[PDB]
Design an enzyme around this catalytic site. Structure first.
Site, PDB file in Angstrom:
ATOM      1  CG  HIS A 116      40.316  45.450  43.367  1.00  0.00           C
ATOM      2  ND1 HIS A 116      41.888  45.642  42.592  1.00  0.00           N
ATOM      3  CD2 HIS A 116      40.426  45.116  43.737  1.00  0.00           C
ATOM      4  CE1 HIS A 116      42.794  44.638  42.690  1.00  0.00           C
ATOM      5  NE2 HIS A 116      41.854  43.827  43.664  1.00  0.00           N
ATOM      6  CG  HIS A 148      36.102  42.843  41.993  1.00  0.00           C
ATOM      7  ND1 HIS A 148      36.784  41.056  41.611  1.00  0.00           N
ATOM      8  CD2 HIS A 148      36.526  42.825  43.248  1.00  0.00           C
ATOM      9  CE1 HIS A 148      37.770  40.879  42.357  1.00  0.00           C
ATOM     10  NE2 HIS A 148      37.412  41.254  43.336  1.00  0.00           N
ATOM     11  CG  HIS A 192      36.427  41.543  48.919  1.00  0.00           C
ATOM     12  ND1 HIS A 192      35.253  41.694  47.998  1.00  0.00           N
ATOM     13  CD2 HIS A 192      37.546  40.959  48.022  1.00  0.00           C
ATOM     14  CE1 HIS A 192      35.420  40.887  46.307  1.00  0.00           C
ATOM     15  NE2 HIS A 192      36.570  40.944  46.490  1.00  0.00           N
ATOM     16  CG  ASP A 193      38.142  44.272  46.895  1.00  0.00           C
ATOM     17  OD1 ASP A 193      39.376  44.116  47.684  1.00  0.00           O
ATOM     18  OD2 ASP A 193      38.563  43.507  45.993  1.00  0.00           O
ATOM     19  CG  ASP A 227      39.144  38.601  46.048  1.00  0.00           C
ATOM     20  OD1 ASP A 227      38.867  39.116  44.928  1.00  0.00           O
ATOM     21  OD2 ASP A 227      39.942  38.813  46.937  1.00  0.00           O
ATOM     22  CG  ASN A 236      38.430  37.951  37.358  1.00  0.00           C
ATOM     23  OD1 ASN A 236      39.385  38.721  37.367  1.00  0.00           O
ATOM     24  ND2 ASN A 236      37.407  38.122  37.989  1.00  0.00           N
ATOM     25  CD  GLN A 241      46.018  36.339  34.187  1.00  0.00           C
ATOM     26  OE1 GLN A 241      45.176  35.768  34.333  1.00  0.00           O
ATOM     27  NE2 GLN A 241      45.985  37.934  34.650  1.00  0.00           N
ATOM     28  CG  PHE A 278      47.482  34.970  38.108  1.00  0.00           C
ATOM     29  CD1 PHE A 278      47.171  34.761  39.372  1.00  0.00           C
ATOM     30  CD2 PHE A 278      45.750  34.830  37.780  1.00  0.00           C
ATOM     31  CE1 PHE A 278      46.510  35.691  40.729  1.00  0.00           C
ATOM     32  CE2 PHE A 278      44.133  35.022  38.522  1.00  0.00           C
ATOM     33  CZ  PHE A 278      45.142  35.269  39.637  1.00  0.00           C
TER      34      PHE A 278
HETATM   35  C1  LIG Z   1      42.341  38.612  35.891  1.00  0.00           C
HETATM   36  O1  LIG Z   1      43.988  38.812  35.922  1.00  0.00           O
HETATM   37  C2  LIG Z   1      44.227  38.139  37.110  1.00  0.00           C
HETATM   38  C3  LIG Z   1      43.469  39.135  38.400  1.00  0.00           C
HETATM   39  C4  LIG Z   1      42.978  39.200  40.089  1.00  0.00           C
HETATM   40  C5  LIG Z   1      44.189  39.140  40.219  1.00  0.00           C
HETATM   41  C6  LIG Z   1      45.014  38.997  41.595  1.00  0.00           C
HETATM   42  O2  LIG Z   1      45.392  39.100  42.510  1.00  0.00           O
HETATM   43  N1  LIG Z   1      43.538  39.945  42.763  1.00  0.00           N
HETATM   44  C7  LIG Z   1      43.937  39.745  44.103  1.00  0.00           C
HETATM   45  C8  LIG Z   1      44.872  40.861  44.871  1.00  0.00           C
HETATM   46 CL1  LIG Z   1      45.288  41.800  43.113  1.00  0.00          CL
HETATM   47  C9  LIG Z   1      44.531  41.551  45.771  1.00  0.00           C
HETATM   48  N2  LIG Z   1      43.886  40.592  46.637  1.00  0.00           N
HETATM   49  C10 LIG Z   1      42.933  39.465  46.400  1.00  0.00           C
HETATM   50  C11 LIG Z   1      42.988  39.231  45.278  1.00  0.00           C
HETATM   51 CL2  LIG Z   1      42.053  37.913  44.042  1.00  0.00          CL
HETATM   52  C12 LIG Z   1      45.753  39.426  39.532  1.00  0.00           C
HETATM   53  C13 LIG Z   1      45.367  38.913  37.575  1.00  0.00           C
HETATM   54  O3  LIG Z   1      46.392  38.395  37.830  1.00  0.00           O
HETATM   55  C14 LIG Z   1      47.419  38.108  38.011  1.00  0.00           C
HETATM   56  C15 LIG Z   1      48.055  40.211  38.243  1.00  0.00           C
HETATM   57  C16 LIG Z   1      48.846  40.365  37.065  1.00  0.00           C
HETATM   58  C17 LIG Z   1      48.668  39.146  35.931  1.00  0.00           C
HETATM   59  C18 LIG Z   1      49.095  37.591  36.812  1.00  0.00           C
HETATM   60 MG   LIG Z   2      40.851  43.080  48.000  1.00  0.00          MG
HETATM   61 ZN   LIG Z   3      38.850  41.417  45.632  1.00  0.00          ZN
END
Ligand SMILES: COc1ccc(C(=O)Nc2c(Cl)cncc2Cl)cc1OC1CCCC1
Ligand SMILES: [Mg+2]
Ligand SMILES: [Zn+2]
Length: 322
Positions: A75, A79, A115-116, A229, A232, A280, A283
Site C-alpha cells: 500500500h 499501488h 484511495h490509500d 483495486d 493485480n 491466490q 482470492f
Molecule cells: C496480489 O494479491 C492480493 C492483492 C490485493 C489484495 C487485497 O485484498 N487488496 C485490498 C485490501 Cl488488502 C484492502 N482493501 C481493498 C483491497 Cl482491493 C489481496 C491479495 O491477495 C490476497 C491477500 C493475501 C493472499 C490473498
Molecule cells: Mg484501501
Molecule cells: Zn488499494
C-alpha cells in the site's frame, strides 16, 4: 537525459493494461503517482478543462505521493499509481464511451490517486483489535478509508495545492461527494453488496451503456475503482507475481506485529504457516473472478482479454500447488 527518454518511452503505454508501473517507479525517481497522474491529466485534457495550473497539479501530486509510506510493501505510491492507471483504462472502455461527464472522470481518477494515502500497512481489523487512534477516531467503521479521504482532501489546502481552485462551488460539492462515495466503496466489507448491485445492473442493462441517475452512475464508478483495486491478478504474470510478493510481505509484517503483542495471527499473515499459491487461487475464485466476470458482462466484450488473463493466471498459480 537518457533516463528521462526511457521514462517517456514507458509512459507511451499509459492507455494499456499491463503498463510497466514498477519500471516507471524507478525511472521517475520514485514518483510513479506524480508522473502517471500528470500524464493522464494531459492525455484527457483535464488541465485545460478544469483550469488547473500545471505547477499546482505537480505540487499537489508530489505532496500526495509523499504521504504514501516508503516502507509499506504493497500500500504505497506504486499501488496508488497502478490503481489510477487501471481506472484510466477502464474509463476508456468502448462500452462506456460518452457515458460519464468530465467531472465524474476527474472524480474517479482523483479518488484512485488518494484511495490509500497514509496507509500504515495494517488492516482495519488490526487497527480495531489494537485499540488504535485511527479506530477510536472513526468508530471502527471504514477506518482506513475515512482516513485516506481526510488526508487526500486536507492536502489540497497546502500552499499551491488546490487543483480544484477554478471549479465552481457546485462542481466542488459534487466532486467531493463522488470522491467520498468512491473511496468508501474500496472497503472490502462492502465488496459483496457492491457486487450484488453490479449484477443487478448487468441484469437490467439498457444499451453503449445507459445510466441516467446518480445511483447508477456512482455505482458503476465505485465498482470501476474497486475493480482497479482488485486488478493485480488480471495483469500480465510478471506484474501479478510482484504484487503477490508485496502483499504477502505486508501481511507477514502485520502478523509479526500481532505475534509480538501476543495476539492471534490473522489469516494469511503467518510467515511460518502460509500457502501463498493456494491463497491466490482462493482470492481469485471467491473475490476477483466473481467481480471481474460481472464487470466483463457489463462491458461485453471489451474486457474479454483482461478476463482471459485472469483465468490464465489462476490456472498458473493452481498448477504450482501439486
Ligand atoms: C496480489 O494479491 C492480493 C492483492 C490485493 C489484495 C487485497 O485484498 N487488496 C485490498 C485490501 Cl488488502 C484492502 N482493501 C481493498 C483491497 Cl482491493 C489481496 C491479495 O491477495 C490476497 C491477500 C493475501 C493472499 C490473498
Ligand atoms: Mg484501501
Ligand atoms: Zn488499494
Amino acid at each position: 537525459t537518457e533516463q528521462e527518454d526511457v521514462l517517456a518511452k514507458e509512459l507511451e503505454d499509459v492507455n494499456k493494461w499491463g503498463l510497466h508501473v514498477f519500471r516507471i517507479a524507478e525511472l521517475s525517481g520514485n514518483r510513479p503517482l506524480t508522473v502517471i497522474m500528470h500524464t493522464i491529466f494531459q492525455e484527457r485534457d483535464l488541465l485545460k478543462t478544469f483550469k488547473i495550473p500545471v505547477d499546482t497539479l505537480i505540487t499537489y501530486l508530489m505532496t500526495l505521493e509523499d504521504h504514501y509510506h516508503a516502507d509499506v510493501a504493497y500500500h504505497n505510491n506504486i499501488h496508488a499509481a497502478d490503481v489510477v492507471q487501471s481506472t484510466h483504462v477502464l474509463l476508456s472502455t468502448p462500452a462506456l464511451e460518452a457515458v460519464f461527464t468530465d467531472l465524474e472522470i476527474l472524480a474517479a481518477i482523483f479518488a484512485s490517486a488518494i484511495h490509500d494515502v497514509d496507509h500504515p500497512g495494517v488492516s482495519n481489523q488490526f487497527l480495531i483489535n489494537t485499540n488504535s487512534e485511527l479506530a477510536l477516531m472513526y468508530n471502527d467503521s471504514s477506518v482506513l478509508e475515512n482516513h485516506h479521504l481526510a488526508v487526500g482532501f486536507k492536502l489540497l489546502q497546502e500552499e499551491n495545492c488546490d487543483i480544484f481552485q477554478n471549479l465552481t462551488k457546485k462542481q466542488r460539492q459534487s466532486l467531493r461527494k463522488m470522491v467520498i462515495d468512491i473511496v468508501l466503496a474500496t472497503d472490502m466489507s462492502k465488496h459483496m453488496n457492491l457486487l450484488a448491485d453490479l449484477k443487478t445492473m448487468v441484469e437490467t442493462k439498457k444499451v453503449v451503456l445507459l445510466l441516467d441517475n446518480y445511483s447508477d452512475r456512482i455505482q458503476v464508478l465505485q465498482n470501476m475503482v474497486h475493480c482497479a483495486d482488485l486488478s493485480n491478478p488480471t495483469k500480465p504474470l510478471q506484474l501479478y507475481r510482484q504484487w503477490t510478493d508485496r502483499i504477502m510481505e505486508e501481511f507477514f509484517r502485520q502478523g509479526d506485529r500481532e505475534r509480538e503483542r501476543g495476539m492471534e495471527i490473522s489469516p494469511m499473515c503467518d510467515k511460518h504457516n502460509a500457502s501463498v499459491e493456494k491463497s491466490q487461487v482462493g482470492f481469485i475464485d471467491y473475490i476477483v473472478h466473481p467481480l471481474w466476470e460481472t464487470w466483463a458482462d457489463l462491458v461485453h466484450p471489451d474486457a474479454q482479454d483482461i478476463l482471459d488473463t485472469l483465468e490464465d493466471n489462476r490456472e498458473w498459480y493452481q498448477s504450482t500447488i501439486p
